[PDB]
Short mmCIF file of all heavy atoms in Angstrom, two decimals:
data_model
loop_
_atom_site.label_atom_id
_atom_site.label_comp_id
_atom_site.label_asym_id
_atom_site.label_seq_id
_atom_site.Cartn_x
_atom_site.Cartn_y
_atom_site.Cartn_z
N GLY A 99 8.90 -7.31 -0.97
CA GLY A 99 9.74 -6.93 0.14
C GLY A 99 9.23 -5.77 0.97
O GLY A 99 9.79 -5.49 2.03
N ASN A 100 8.18 -5.08 0.52
CA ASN A 100 7.56 -4.03 1.31
C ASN A 100 6.69 -4.63 2.41
O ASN A 100 6.14 -5.72 2.25
CB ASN A 100 6.73 -3.11 0.43
CG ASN A 100 7.57 -2.15 -0.39
OD1 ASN A 100 8.80 -2.12 -0.26
ND2 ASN A 100 6.93 -1.37 -1.25
N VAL A 101 6.58 -3.91 3.52
CA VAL A 101 5.68 -4.28 4.61
C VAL A 101 4.40 -3.46 4.48
O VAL A 101 4.45 -2.23 4.39
CB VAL A 101 6.35 -4.07 5.98
CG1 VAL A 101 6.63 -2.60 6.23
CG2 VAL A 101 5.47 -4.65 7.09
N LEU A 102 3.27 -4.15 4.45
CA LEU A 102 1.97 -3.51 4.31
C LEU A 102 0.98 -4.11 5.31
O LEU A 102 1.13 -5.26 5.71
CB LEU A 102 1.42 -3.69 2.89
CG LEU A 102 1.75 -2.61 1.86
CD1 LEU A 102 3.14 -2.82 1.27
CD2 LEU A 102 0.70 -2.58 0.77
N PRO A 103 -0.03 -3.34 5.72
CA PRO A 103 -1.14 -3.95 6.46
C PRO A 103 -1.86 -4.97 5.61
O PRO A 103 -2.00 -4.80 4.39
CB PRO A 103 -2.03 -2.75 6.81
CG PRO A 103 -1.15 -1.55 6.69
CD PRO A 103 -0.17 -1.88 5.62
N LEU A 104 -2.33 -6.04 6.25
CA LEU A 104 -2.99 -7.11 5.51
C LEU A 104 -4.32 -6.67 4.90
O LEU A 104 -4.75 -7.27 3.91
CB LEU A 104 -3.21 -8.32 6.42
CG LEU A 104 -2.34 -9.52 6.05
CD1 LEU A 104 -0.87 -9.21 6.29
CD2 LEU A 104 -2.77 -10.75 6.83
N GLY A 105 -4.97 -5.66 5.46
CA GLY A 105 -6.25 -5.22 4.91
C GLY A 105 -6.12 -4.48 3.60
O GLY A 105 -6.98 -4.60 2.72
N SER A 106 -5.04 -3.70 3.44
CA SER A 106 -4.87 -2.92 2.21
C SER A 106 -4.63 -3.82 1.00
O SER A 106 -4.97 -3.44 -0.12
CB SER A 106 -3.71 -1.94 2.38
OG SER A 106 -3.96 -1.05 3.45
N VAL A 107 -4.05 -5.00 1.21
CA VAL A 107 -3.65 -5.85 0.10
C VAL A 107 -4.89 -6.44 -0.58
O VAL A 107 -5.88 -6.73 0.11
CB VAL A 107 -2.70 -6.97 0.57
CG1 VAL A 107 -1.63 -6.42 1.49
CG2 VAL A 107 -3.49 -8.08 1.25
N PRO A 108 -4.88 -6.63 -1.90
CA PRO A 108 -5.99 -7.34 -2.54
C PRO A 108 -6.05 -8.79 -2.09
O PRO A 108 -5.03 -9.40 -1.77
CB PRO A 108 -5.67 -7.23 -4.04
CG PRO A 108 -4.20 -7.00 -4.10
CD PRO A 108 -3.83 -6.24 -2.86
N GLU A 109 -7.26 -9.33 -2.05
CA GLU A 109 -7.45 -10.70 -1.60
C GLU A 109 -6.62 -11.66 -2.45
O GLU A 109 -6.52 -11.51 -3.67
CB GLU A 109 -8.93 -11.09 -1.65
CG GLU A 109 -9.57 -10.91 -3.02
CD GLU A 109 -10.95 -11.53 -3.10
OE1 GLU A 109 -11.06 -12.76 -2.92
OE2 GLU A 109 -11.93 -10.78 -3.34
N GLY A 110 -6.03 -12.66 -1.79
CA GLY A 110 -5.13 -13.59 -2.43
C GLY A 110 -3.69 -13.13 -2.49
O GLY A 110 -2.84 -13.88 -3.01
N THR A 111 -3.38 -11.94 -1.98
CA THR A 111 -2.00 -11.46 -1.98
C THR A 111 -1.13 -12.34 -1.10
O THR A 111 -1.55 -12.79 -0.03
CB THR A 111 -1.95 -10.02 -1.49
OG1 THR A 111 -2.67 -9.17 -2.40
CG2 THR A 111 -0.51 -9.53 -1.40
N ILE A 112 0.09 -12.59 -1.56
CA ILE A 112 1.07 -13.36 -0.80
C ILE A 112 1.86 -12.41 0.10
O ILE A 112 2.26 -11.32 -0.33
CB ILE A 112 2.00 -14.14 -1.74
CG1 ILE A 112 1.19 -15.08 -2.63
CG2 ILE A 112 3.03 -14.92 -0.93
CD1 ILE A 112 0.93 -14.54 -4.02
N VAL A 113 2.10 -12.83 1.34
CA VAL A 113 2.83 -12.05 2.33
C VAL A 113 3.50 -13.02 3.30
O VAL A 113 3.19 -14.21 3.34
CB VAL A 113 1.92 -11.07 3.10
CG1 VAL A 113 1.30 -10.05 2.16
CG2 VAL A 113 0.84 -11.82 3.86
N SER A 114 4.44 -12.49 4.08
CA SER A 114 5.17 -13.30 5.05
C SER A 114 5.51 -12.43 6.26
O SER A 114 5.40 -11.20 6.22
CB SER A 114 6.44 -13.90 4.45
OG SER A 114 7.33 -12.89 4.02
N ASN A 115 5.92 -13.09 7.34
CA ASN A 115 6.25 -12.42 8.59
C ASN A 115 5.09 -11.56 9.08
O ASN A 115 5.30 -10.55 9.76
CB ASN A 115 7.52 -11.58 8.46
CG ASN A 115 8.18 -11.29 9.79
OD1 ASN A 115 8.07 -12.07 10.73
ND2 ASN A 115 8.86 -10.15 9.88
N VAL A 116 3.86 -11.95 8.73
CA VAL A 116 2.69 -11.17 9.12
C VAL A 116 2.52 -11.22 10.63
O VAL A 116 2.77 -12.25 11.28
CB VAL A 116 1.44 -11.69 8.40
CG1 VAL A 116 1.24 -13.17 8.66
CG2 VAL A 116 0.21 -10.90 8.84
N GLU A 117 2.08 -10.10 11.21
CA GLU A 117 1.80 -10.05 12.63
C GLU A 117 0.61 -10.94 12.98
O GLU A 117 -0.40 -10.95 12.28
CB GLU A 117 1.51 -8.61 13.06
CG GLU A 117 2.55 -7.60 12.60
CD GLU A 117 2.32 -6.22 13.18
OE1 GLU A 117 1.20 -5.68 13.01
OE2 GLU A 117 3.25 -5.67 13.81
N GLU A 118 0.74 -11.68 14.08
CA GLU A 118 -0.42 -12.39 14.61
C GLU A 118 -1.43 -11.42 15.21
O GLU A 118 -2.64 -11.56 15.02
CB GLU A 118 0.02 -13.42 15.66
CG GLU A 118 0.32 -14.80 15.11
CD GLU A 118 0.31 -15.87 16.18
OE1 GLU A 118 1.06 -15.74 17.16
OE2 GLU A 118 -0.46 -16.85 16.03
N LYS A 119 -0.93 -10.42 15.93
CA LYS A 119 -1.71 -9.31 16.45
C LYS A 119 -0.92 -8.04 16.21
O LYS A 119 0.31 -8.09 16.11
CB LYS A 119 -2.01 -9.47 17.95
CG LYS A 119 -3.04 -10.54 18.26
CD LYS A 119 -3.16 -10.78 19.76
CE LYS A 119 -4.30 -11.73 20.09
NZ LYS A 119 -4.32 -12.11 21.52
N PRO A 120 -1.58 -6.88 16.12
CA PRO A 120 -0.84 -5.66 15.82
C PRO A 120 0.20 -5.36 16.90
O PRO A 120 -0.03 -5.59 18.09
CB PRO A 120 -1.93 -4.58 15.77
CG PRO A 120 -3.10 -5.16 16.49
CD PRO A 120 -3.02 -6.64 16.27
N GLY A 121 1.35 -4.84 16.47
CA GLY A 121 2.42 -4.49 17.36
C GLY A 121 3.36 -5.61 17.74
O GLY A 121 4.32 -5.37 18.49
N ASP A 122 3.14 -6.84 17.26
CA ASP A 122 4.04 -7.94 17.57
C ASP A 122 5.29 -7.95 16.69
O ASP A 122 6.20 -8.73 16.96
CB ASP A 122 3.30 -9.28 17.44
CG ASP A 122 2.85 -9.58 16.03
OD1 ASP A 122 3.55 -9.21 15.06
OD2 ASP A 122 1.78 -10.21 15.87
N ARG A 123 5.34 -7.11 15.65
CA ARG A 123 6.51 -7.00 14.79
C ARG A 123 6.82 -8.32 14.08
O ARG A 123 7.98 -8.72 13.95
CB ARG A 123 7.72 -6.50 15.58
CG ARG A 123 7.47 -5.20 16.33
CD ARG A 123 8.64 -4.84 17.23
NE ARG A 123 9.81 -4.41 16.46
CZ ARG A 123 10.91 -3.90 17.00
NH1 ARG A 123 11.01 -3.76 18.32
NH2 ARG A 123 11.92 -3.54 16.22
N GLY A 124 5.78 -9.01 13.62
CA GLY A 124 5.95 -10.18 12.79
C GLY A 124 5.99 -11.48 13.57
O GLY A 124 6.89 -11.69 14.38
N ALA A 125 5.03 -12.37 13.32
CA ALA A 125 4.94 -13.62 14.05
C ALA A 125 4.89 -14.86 13.17
O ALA A 125 5.54 -15.86 13.49
CB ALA A 125 3.70 -13.59 14.96
N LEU A 126 4.15 -14.82 12.06
CA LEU A 126 3.87 -16.01 11.28
C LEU A 126 4.77 -16.11 10.05
O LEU A 126 5.28 -15.11 9.54
CB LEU A 126 2.41 -16.04 10.84
CG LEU A 126 1.37 -15.83 11.95
CD1 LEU A 126 0.07 -15.29 11.37
CD2 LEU A 126 1.13 -17.13 12.70
N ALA A 127 4.96 -17.34 9.57
CA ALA A 127 5.67 -17.62 8.33
C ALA A 127 7.09 -17.06 8.34
O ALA A 127 7.62 -16.66 7.30
CB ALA A 127 4.90 -17.09 7.12
N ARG A 128 7.73 -17.03 9.51
CA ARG A 128 9.11 -16.56 9.59
C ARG A 128 10.09 -17.55 8.97
O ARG A 128 11.19 -17.15 8.60
CB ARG A 128 9.48 -16.29 11.05
CG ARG A 128 8.48 -15.41 11.78
CD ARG A 128 8.99 -14.99 13.14
NE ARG A 128 9.44 -13.60 13.16
CZ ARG A 128 10.23 -13.08 14.10
NH1 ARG A 128 10.67 -13.83 15.10
NH2 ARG A 128 10.58 -11.80 14.03
N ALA A 129 9.72 -18.83 8.86
CA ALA A 129 10.61 -19.82 8.28
C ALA A 129 10.76 -19.61 6.78
O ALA A 129 9.87 -19.08 6.11
CB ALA A 129 10.10 -21.23 8.56
N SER A 130 11.91 -20.03 6.25
CA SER A 130 12.19 -19.84 4.84
C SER A 130 11.19 -20.59 3.97
O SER A 130 10.83 -21.73 4.26
CB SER A 130 13.62 -20.31 4.52
OG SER A 130 13.71 -21.72 4.56
N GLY A 131 10.75 -19.93 2.90
CA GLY A 131 9.91 -20.56 1.90
C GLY A 131 8.43 -20.60 2.21
O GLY A 131 7.66 -21.10 1.39
N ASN A 132 8.01 -20.10 3.37
CA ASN A 132 6.61 -20.12 3.77
C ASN A 132 5.97 -18.77 3.51
O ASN A 132 6.63 -17.73 3.50
CB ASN A 132 6.48 -20.48 5.25
CG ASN A 132 6.83 -21.93 5.52
OD1 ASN A 132 6.78 -22.78 4.63
ND2 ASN A 132 7.19 -22.23 6.76
N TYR A 133 4.65 -18.79 3.29
CA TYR A 133 3.90 -17.57 3.04
C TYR A 133 2.43 -17.83 3.32
O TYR A 133 1.92 -18.92 3.04
CB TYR A 133 4.09 -17.10 1.60
CG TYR A 133 3.69 -18.13 0.57
CD1 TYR A 133 2.41 -18.15 0.04
CD2 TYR A 133 4.59 -19.09 0.13
CE1 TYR A 133 2.03 -19.09 -0.90
CE2 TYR A 133 4.23 -20.04 -0.81
CZ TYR A 133 2.95 -20.03 -1.32
OH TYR A 133 2.58 -20.98 -2.25
N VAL A 134 1.75 -16.82 3.86
CA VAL A 134 0.31 -16.89 4.08
C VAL A 134 -0.41 -16.32 2.86
O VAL A 134 0.16 -15.55 2.08
CB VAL A 134 -0.11 -16.14 5.36
CG1 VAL A 134 0.76 -16.57 6.53
CG2 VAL A 134 -0.02 -14.64 5.15
N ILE A 135 -1.67 -16.71 2.70
CA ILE A 135 -2.53 -16.21 1.63
C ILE A 135 -3.72 -15.51 2.27
O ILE A 135 -4.32 -16.04 3.21
CB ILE A 135 -2.99 -17.33 0.69
CG1 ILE A 135 -1.82 -18.26 0.34
CG2 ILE A 135 -3.61 -16.75 -0.57
CD1 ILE A 135 -2.18 -19.38 -0.62
#
């Protein structure tokens, strides 16, 4: 549930609502049950 920059996370970390570009305040995987790797 914490928000982190994608670079700090170890590779393979699961995240959601990730920004497509910085400052967009979350663009991807906003739908329920989805997550980027």
